A paper describes a structure:
Tom1p is a large, 374 kDa member of a broadly conserved family of HUWE1 factors (also called Mule, Lasu, Ureb1, Arf-BP1, HectH9/E3^Histone^, Ptr1, Upl1, or Eel-1;). This family is characterized by a large N-terminal domain attached to a smaller C-terminal HECT domain (Homologous to E6-AP Carboxyl Terminus) that provides ubiquitin ligase activity ([Fig fig1]). Tom1p has been implicated in the turnover of excess levels of small, basic proteins including ribosomal components and histones. We determined cryo-EM structures of Tom1p to reveal a helical repeat solenoid architecture for the 2,888 residues preceding the C-terminal HECT domain and an overall architecture that resembles the published structures of HUWE1 but with a larger fraction of ordered residues.
In addition to the closed ring structure, the Tom1p^His^ dataset contains particles in “intermediate” and “open” conformations that were reconstructed to resolutions of 7.79 and 7.10 Å, respectively ([Fig fig7], S6C-D). The distinction between closed and open/intermediate conformations is modeled as a rigid body hinging of 30° (open) or 15° (intermediate) centered at a loop (1316-1320) in the middle of the Body domain at the opposite side of the ring from the N-terminal Head and C-terminal HECT domains ([Fig fig7], 7C). The resolution does not allow precise modeling of the change in conformation, but apart from the rigid body rotations, conformational changes appear to be limited to some repacking of the interface between the two halves of the Body domain and modest shift in adjacent helices ([Fig fig7]). When aligned separately, the N-terminal and C-terminal halves of closed, intermediate, and open conformation Tom1 superimpose closely. The hinging motion, centered on loop 1316-1320 (green), is ^∽^ 15° and ^∽^30° for the intermediate and open conformations, respectively. Published cryo-EM studies of human HUWE1 indicated the presence of movement towards an open state analogous to that of Tom1p, although density for residues C-terminal to the hinge were not apparent. Our structural analysis revealed a closed solenoidal ring structure and multiple open conformations suggestive of dynamic conformational changes to a spiral shape. One possibility is that this ∼29 kDa domain occupies the solenoidal basket, perhaps extending above the basket rim, and that it retains basic substrate proteins in the central region of the solenoid. It is also possible that the shift from the closed ring to the open spiral form is important for function. Mutations expected to destabilize closure of the ring conformation were reported to compromise E3 ligase activity of human HUWE1 and similar mutations of *Nematocida* HUWE1 were found to destabilize the protein.
Author numbering: 2 to 154, 158 to 213, 236 to 1073, 1076 to 1534, 1539 to 1592, 1598 to 1872, 2220 to 2230
Amino acid sequence: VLFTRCEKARKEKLAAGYKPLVDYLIDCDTPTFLERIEAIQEWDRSRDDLYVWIPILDRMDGLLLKVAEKYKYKQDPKKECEVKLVEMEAHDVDYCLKMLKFTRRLLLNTENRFVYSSGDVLMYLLNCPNFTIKLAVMRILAILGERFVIAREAHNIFGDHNLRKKTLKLALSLSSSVMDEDGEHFSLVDLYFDKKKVPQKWRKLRFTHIKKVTMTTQELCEHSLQQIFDKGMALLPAESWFDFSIKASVAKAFSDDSGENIDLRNIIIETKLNAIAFVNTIFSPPQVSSKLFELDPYAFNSLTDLISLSETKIPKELRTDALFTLECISLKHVWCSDIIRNLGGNISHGLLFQILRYIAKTLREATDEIDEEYNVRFFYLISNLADVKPLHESLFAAGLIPTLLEIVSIRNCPYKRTLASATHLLETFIDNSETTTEFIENDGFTMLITSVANEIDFTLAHPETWQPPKYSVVYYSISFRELAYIRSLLKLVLKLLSTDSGDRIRNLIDSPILVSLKKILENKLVFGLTLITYTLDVVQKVINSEPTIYPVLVEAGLIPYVIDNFPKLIGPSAELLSLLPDVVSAICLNPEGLKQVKEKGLINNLFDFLLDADHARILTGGDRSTEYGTDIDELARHYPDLKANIVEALCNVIRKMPSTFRNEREFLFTSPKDQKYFFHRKNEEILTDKEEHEPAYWELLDKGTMLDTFTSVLFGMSLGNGSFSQVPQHLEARDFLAIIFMENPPYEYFTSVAISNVTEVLQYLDEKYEDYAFMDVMKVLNDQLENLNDFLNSPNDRSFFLERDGENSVRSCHSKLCRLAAILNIVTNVYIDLTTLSCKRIMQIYSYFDKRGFSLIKNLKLLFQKCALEEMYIRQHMPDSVITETMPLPIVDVSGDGPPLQIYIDDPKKGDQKGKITSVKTRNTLQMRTILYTLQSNTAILFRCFLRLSHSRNMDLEHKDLTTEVHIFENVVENVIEMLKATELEGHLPYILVLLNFNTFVFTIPKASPNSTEILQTIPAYIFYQKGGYLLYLHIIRDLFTRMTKILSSLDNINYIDESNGILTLSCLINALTFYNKSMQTETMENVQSIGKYYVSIDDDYNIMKALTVPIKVMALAMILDLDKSDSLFKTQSRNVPYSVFKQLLSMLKNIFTNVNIYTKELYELHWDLIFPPIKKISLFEQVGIPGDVAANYLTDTGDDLPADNSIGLFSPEQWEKYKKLIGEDKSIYYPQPMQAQYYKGCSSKELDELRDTFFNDGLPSRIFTVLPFYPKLVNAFAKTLLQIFTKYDEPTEVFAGRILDRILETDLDDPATLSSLIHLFGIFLNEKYIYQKASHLMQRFIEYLEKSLKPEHVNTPWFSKALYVYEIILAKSELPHLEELSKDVLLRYPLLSMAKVFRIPDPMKQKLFDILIRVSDISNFYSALATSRILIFYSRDELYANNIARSGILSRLLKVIGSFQKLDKINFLESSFLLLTRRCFETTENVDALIRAEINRSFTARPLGAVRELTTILEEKAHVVMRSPSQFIDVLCETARFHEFDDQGALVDYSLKRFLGEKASSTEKSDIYERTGIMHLLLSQLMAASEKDWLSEPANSSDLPENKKAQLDPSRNPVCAYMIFLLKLLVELVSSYNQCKFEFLTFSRRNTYAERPRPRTTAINFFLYRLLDKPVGTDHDKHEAKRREVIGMLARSVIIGFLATVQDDRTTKTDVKLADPHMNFIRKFAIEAIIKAIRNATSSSKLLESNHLKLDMWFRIITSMVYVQAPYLRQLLDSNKVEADQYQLCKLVIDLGLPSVITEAMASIDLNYPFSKKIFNVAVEALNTISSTRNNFSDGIILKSTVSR
């Protein structure tokens, strides 16, 4: 719970209210408590919350907590012993029943019972044989569950089985209405009716569980409770005893037929009633009726008939016991209508109002026959039963109101309670205007005034009694119950006030109180209080009901006086203080009330409580407050003139508001162990406690508390202005901002909660006038700082605060310090930012620059310096046993101001670990210590924000910034860096390192937006250039890498903060790395322009950033050489640099080359006043005396120069005296003078190039290679600077690679799994190809070993997984599109030379390891397989190489590896490669070589323009066919495109291919038949096993939509089908491409068979014609498989249709092809007929007819695609020429068959009584249309790829 200070504070305030009372209980013994248990009953007055009694609640708990263990009743809802039911001791039962019933009454007399501080024995004591304990607990528990649902459903015991199921079964413990052998039922109407048949067989019980038991008759007469359960568990399983006990109690009641039988009957009845109430609370008719109303629905009318006070006979025990249960169930709508109709809800006579009028009379007599409890209970029940409005009118038709008004006349009776309940029910039912005119005309609108007068007089009839609440505050003095009944009266009257008000107000303009209402005006203690709140409610309603009567009743004299006493009665009433404008504001304009308001000047009277936290708490500190802060603006609309009052009527008080504050408690406290604020050692004692670091007092204090609601209303009103339109004009905020310092403004300003309502309101001036102080605020702010600059100016050594502990030092200033810091952070956050943009604040800021400039920053430097040095210092004095939990800064809410991650204790993952123990040193300080860094570094982020501005701000601004802003930055950079300028390395380490971290963080424009780089301000960079501390760092780094030696677990992959001196070593260092990297990156930074451009009187002309890039780099090169002088790690070992840091170097190494194109002409200077145009000359002109204008005349006349002369026109000789004094003999030095490349001369390549050569002269770029092995693996990416050094050469690394080739066997397995790595980089030397052209000898000088490497079982080379690729480099060269390196020895005027020397990979070499190639098969890795495949595909070159690679077994490896896959990820690349493979793997010479050769006059010809298709425009565009088979391609080219336009004379000038060919059976019936090798016979069987292994399953997918985003979208999800799709695609593709693949399937069978002309083993073909494609399934079990089958219906069509193709190549013309070969022509028809039978199979067995359906469904689609030679995935590979005889020799072919009309009988073969049989043939009709239509002329992810596409 968000127990914000206010909430819990109110909770304690409750204690003061009644803790003094409960002291009675808290301060008494248990026996005394025991005596009081039943001596309390219920309040004489209203209910109360039990929070303050939470202690007494737990007292009762303990009193009755262990008693569960007293008889073991402490039960586990996991141990099935049920804590054996043994009788609880009567007095101990009473000890419990006392508190139970006392707890029962407490609940029933308490309100807001959600505290739950007296539980813990919940399921436990109820486990007792006696119903006394068991039923008392059952009742109180039903009530508890009701309150719990009343809380919309505090223990979470719902997991219990024992009690939960006990109650669930008690819902039908035995039965609701029951039935007996006699016609009677034991009807519910038999509450106490022993006047019916009473079966005696129920002396026993029988309980199966199949474990059946008995308690036979008269056996359950001596065995009682304990013995019953003993023999039960003897007969029963110990776990289950519930129904045994239920029926045993039933029998024990039965055991006799005496009062015990009736008594125990009532007891079990009430148990069941509590169970039913709770069940309906938790269960619903879906469950309730599901349990009973299939058992005994004799409930509704029964209950309607059971009980009635008219039936004043029922022993009220069960009557009431049901009542509340009955009531609870009746609350439901389902049951409401039930008993409503049972009563006959339109009677006025039945029990509906029979009892109503009976009780009405009972009230008139008041003969103590009035059970106030029962009375009020049904009152409120019917209040609840007002639920059903239609039945509300039904009752309105049941003589509703007048039947009720019989009671309204019953007064002067003692039953104020039931009288109050009657008023409440009356208020409840009132909904109708027809009910109004009923009541009004019933004469009910006379008993109103009747009771009015009666009780108004009665008020003074009993001043003697007047016994208000005793133990609670009583504003009034009259007896409680009376004026509570009156509260009900007033509520009813008010709610009636609004409706039908005009006529009735006229009726009772003088109700018997109207003129005597003044009774109430002053009868505060006589007529009660907060009833006057309800009089105000009347007034407001009147102020809206009939304001016209206001002046009329102003004449009554009551209204005018109210204004007279109005100032006095203004007080703490939220309602009033919420409804005040509703009552007052509007009347300000009503003439009568207008004058009445104007008199006395009521505005000031309104506020009065202005300085009263009571009222602030009253108004909720919000909402109502804020709401009111918006509402009371209504009078402002009425009377803006009063605003001056509402302005000053308060400012008299507001302006005093700062003056209000009083001194308050301490904030710092010394340790009650040594009286010290801070721990002085790592091993220091803990001032242990479970307190909270922050003492919450201010907000709790009236000033904070009041100001809460204050700001609430402030933000309500000031919103849109108001008095604030004049308060700034009246009051000055800064003058008023003493509220910002207050008196003791504590540490807990972090509790600055009203800020929004504070700052947001303040923004209105930010909207109106920041300049309404702003710089003034900050000036007085500084003033304060200087005032605080007392122990701010403290020792620079360490924490004197630690030393001075036990003293008032900070205590004195403490609160002010945090006050100030946090308030300023807030000010900055809200206002001070680059977002302001307003020129006015810009100029005011400039005015500040003028008056002080920057000196504040010095105080800031000192403060920050002292800031955490202490904690840093104390940290060593600070118990890490305490830091580990305390960890001041590493605490919740610490998220901003770029935390320069600090030295934490545990993993930062866990962070805050408070709450266990506290310490005064921790407590008062942790609240502070955490704060400090937050207070700071938000300073620094803003400081950096003070840099760019106009560069990006550039709204209306001025020149002032020209000199000052530069002056400011100078007054900034060194000013704070001085803090660290001196700090050396260590001891300073912990503090200064982090300081440096954030320092590097700053100096960078806070620019990331698109995650970009902070833009690394140019200005401060140059202001540090003049500082040159870069070079200081270049010195330090010497220590730093050497500081490795002073340093573990790992190098690169360790994080978090426990302890790492190594981390300490480079912690700060890391930033300098990135800094320097981007330090060279002006491209990543802005681009300032040149000082030479700015200043013409200079030598160093240069763009600032561009020049400064270099000199840092020349010094960096010097440093590089220095470090390498020792070799550092440059050619050394120990892999010290972290892999991460090593990689980092590369960036830090890339920059090495990074260079500005133009030569850099040295770096010059910095000056704030020597700005262009020089202000210095004019400055000295008026320093001698010449005014600016006359002084300017010179520079504007000359510019960028200095006169240094006397007796000029503007510099007249009388200026000689004031110039000679100014003459310093250095006037020429009044301009910047060049800076230098420290330790060097040229801030340019002047030395960097020479030293680069020196590396090359010194061969360093190779010494690195020696140190690569440690972290070289991915550095390949950084082989590009390398590339530039090689462009310059100056050293050969091709020589290095050759030496490695020599060394490449010195690899000597090179740490297997590191062989391939370092050698991958080595081959990456090759990837630096250029020279790769040559070295063929060296290249061969290694390929010789490559041959010798052999590894015939490369499985022995897992590192060869991708040394596959490192070879693949040698592969790419291998043939280098072989072309036999032939010299064309022809007429050419172009080189076309051998750029790369390859020695064309002598063929004998290839076959050798190619034998190994096939002789290695399995090695490792999925992508190694990808490679291997792709290599062999690029290969399979000679096409006899391809032949041999066929039947290579490794094919089988591929098959039963991949197809055996269960779940793979990205085989897609292999799948593309394998499409191309199959194009190559089945590279049928004729069907590829002769294929192209037929396509040649169509490849080059390709239907030319009619024919140029220039060589490079065609030949280089023949790449597809070129690589189809470069060998067979050239062969096909051997006869191609003779080509013309050759320059006659043995000269060639042309490339437009045109004229002639290159110079211009083989197959057989089995050509594409015997090529079949029986692969399918088991290939497709294992393929199906891969596929038919439930290719329909839902994958283990979520996707955020497991089967709707990816099932009807991408059915491939199921991994099983993820490759079945591939199977289909590839198989159909290879079919289409080559005839044999089409023939490859015909003989498939589960077994294996091979016959002449492969005699069709019908298994294959028939199955294809059958389920093979259909794969029928029950239904759309999964959208994955469902959409799968859907797309398959889309696909199988195209699949088979393409199967019907011929070659899908050169002969695609098919212009007049009207036959196939002898073994193909019938293949066209072939197995079809089984489908004709399949069609006929459907025709028979109408369910078989229904079975086929989908086949038929497809059949129409199938037949349409067939005849029309069309499909969804068709013609994307085909030609319209293909369908020239295909369509013909299909349509006319079937015409030859004459088959179609036969299937028409298939329709004739059905009945028209199927839902889709009508629908089914519609598609057929087209198929029917297909019949002659075609021959009538006779007599997305879809992949479609052509052949050349392959």
